[PDB]
């Protein structure tokens, strides 16, 4: 099988860390004792060190490399990296074959100890520019309502962590919801149904949905304060009705490894609230799901309560079977040893952080698609900025009737701009194809004006002057 | 003009290996981790 690019650059490069000679050696110049020996890259003594709070997966995955692979002879290749279950195996190897009659320890999932995660897979999401996600705010702007959005993006090497993947993402795209004041909640199927065939044009694009937002705002007087404090070290970080969606989005997108036994593991995707700062700003934060327990139990058992905090244990109805949820906290005396035998459990406890960041102005690798984003988006129909035909003219309009191509190219590079032409489908599917791929990549000076000397270009450009 | 022998028994150890209380993670999110040069975090303003 076959992994990602980016995940099989990592797996070869071993990310030791080198030390320096030190007064503790006895030793001599020619050598290494065990105080400037290369330190592995999964050691969390020098995470915290540095104020990193994990240990950078492919870093972990070779932590149990040499867990799998010994000096002995082994002759497996077993590579134990699976996801853990929960769920009950119905023919359990032994005298109890139904589970309606017989359960015995083997098959028995244990109680939940409730381990924090220790390896994150994304380690840093990083953007691409301020004006992108400057329009998202401007929704809630205009309408005043709580908006939604999904995260097109790609990946590449961090060099900050120790072997560490960074996120990058390149364009936001809004399904049609019905917004509310309090919350949202919109249909799944129709949502579906249009992710469906925004995943056709971003294969020729090289994109791929890795990412989704939704705002929570709750302004304050709309004078000098910026917005409210909702999310704090007190309250809720996540609230579990959001873990839901989360949960359910990663299981959709799995990440390809060949180190899993069922092909596929360890899945590489961000989830990131606009919130707000504790003081007086609307900083945004991203945590991701983790994969050791939550990713399998919202499957059968996750149930809405009333704490955003927590999430309701509900019961078990004939193969539904879950085990007890410990963990420790403090009582009015003393601190304790795990005292939950009951529900209502929190979920803030199964969420891995990330670094958020966005990168400096003055130098770049690229940016890719920095049109103008001011260009009316798809599906977004509570805003006025849902036009038709009427817009093209006033756009780009093959700038006063006679444009510069310095100045023309510019404006086509939009990635909303460009799902609406094709939806239209006047080009060829071939044509359009070598269109988007002019506007994304570099050396675009030749092929620019095979667009414009060929028909299909001429045909928009007349269909447009006689319309509105 | 005679001897006293006696020999000794141990147990070894047991662990548990309990940590992590909820107090002490709910102050491990909310921090910084640091960003490499010029990733500004940014602040924004609206809705007069
Ligand atoms: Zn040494
Ligand atoms: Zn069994």
């Known amino acids: 099988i076959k992994e990602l690019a980016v995940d099989e650059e990592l797996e070869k490069e071993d990310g030791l860390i080198p030390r320096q000679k030190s007064k503790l050696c006895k030793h001599g110049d020619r050598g290494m004792c065990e105080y400037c ?53 119905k023919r ?9 009659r017989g359960i015995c320890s083997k098959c028995q999932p244990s109680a939940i100890t409730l381990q924090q995660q220790e390896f994150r897979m994304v380690d840093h999401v990083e953007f691409q520019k301020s004006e992108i996600i400057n329009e998202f705010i401007q929704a809630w702007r205009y309408t005043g309502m709580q908006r939604f959005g999904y995260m097109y993006g790609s990946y590449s090497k961090y060099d900050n962590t120790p072997l560490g993947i960074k996120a990058v993402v390149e364009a936001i795209y809004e399904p049609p919801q019905h917004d509310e004041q309090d919350g949202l909640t919109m249909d799944v199927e129709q949502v579906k149904n249009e992710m469906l065939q925004i995943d056709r044009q971003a294969q020729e694009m090289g994109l791929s949905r890795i990412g989704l937002i939704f705002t929570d705002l709750s302004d304050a007087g709309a004078g000098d304060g910026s917005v409210f404090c909702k999310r704090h070290k007190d309250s809720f970080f996540l609230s579990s009705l959001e873990v839901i969606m989360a949960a359910r ?23 990131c609230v606009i919130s707000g700062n504790l003081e007086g700003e609307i900083d945004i934060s991203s945590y991701q799901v983790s994969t050791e327990a939550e990713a399998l139990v919202t499957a059968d058992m996750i149930s809405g309560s009333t704490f955003p905090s927590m999430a309701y244990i509900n019961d078990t109805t004939d193969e539904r079977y879950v085990p007890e949820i410990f963990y420790m906290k403090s009582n ?43 260009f009316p988006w798809s599906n977004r129909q509570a805003m006025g900025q849902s036009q038709d035909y009427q817009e093209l003219k006033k756009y780009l309009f093959n ?54 000397s060929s028909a299909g270009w001429q045909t928009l450009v007349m269909i447009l002057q006689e319309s509105g | 003009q005679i001897f006293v022998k006696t020999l000794t028994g141990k147990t070894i150890t047991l662990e548990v290996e309990s940590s992590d209380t909820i107090d002490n993670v709910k102050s491990k999110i909310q921090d910084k981790e640091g960003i490499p040069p010029d990733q500004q975090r940014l602040i924004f303003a609206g809705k007069q």
């Open chain 1, 249 to 271: 989005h990663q299981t959709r997108h799995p990440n390809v490894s060949k180190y899993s036994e069922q092909g596929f593991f360890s899945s590489k995707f961000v989830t």
């Open chain 1, 332 to 374: 009015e005396y003393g601190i304790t040893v795990k005292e939950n035998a009951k529900p209502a459990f929190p979920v803030d406890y199964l969420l891995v952080t990330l670094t958020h960041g966005f990168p400096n102005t003055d130098t770049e690798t690229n940016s890719k698609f920095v049109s103008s984003t001011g």
């Open chain 1, 92 to 100: 359990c190897h032994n005298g109890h074959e139904p589970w309606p």
């Open chain 1, 399 to 452: 700038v006063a009737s006679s444009g510069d191509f310095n100045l023309l190219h510019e404006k086509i590079s939009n990635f909303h701009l460009l799902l609406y032409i094709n939806s239209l489908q006047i080009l060829s599917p071939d044509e359009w194809k070598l269109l988007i791929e002019s506007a994304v990549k570099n050396e675009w000076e030749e092929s620019l004006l095979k667009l414009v």
């Open chain 1, 37 to 89: 020996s290369p330190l592995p890259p999964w050691d969390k003594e020098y995470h915290e060190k540095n104020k990193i709070k994990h240990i950078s997966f492919h870093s972990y995955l070779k932590k149990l490399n040499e867990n799998a692979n010994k000096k002995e002879n082994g002759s497996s290749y077993i590579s134990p990296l699976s996801e853990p279950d929960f769920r009950i195996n």
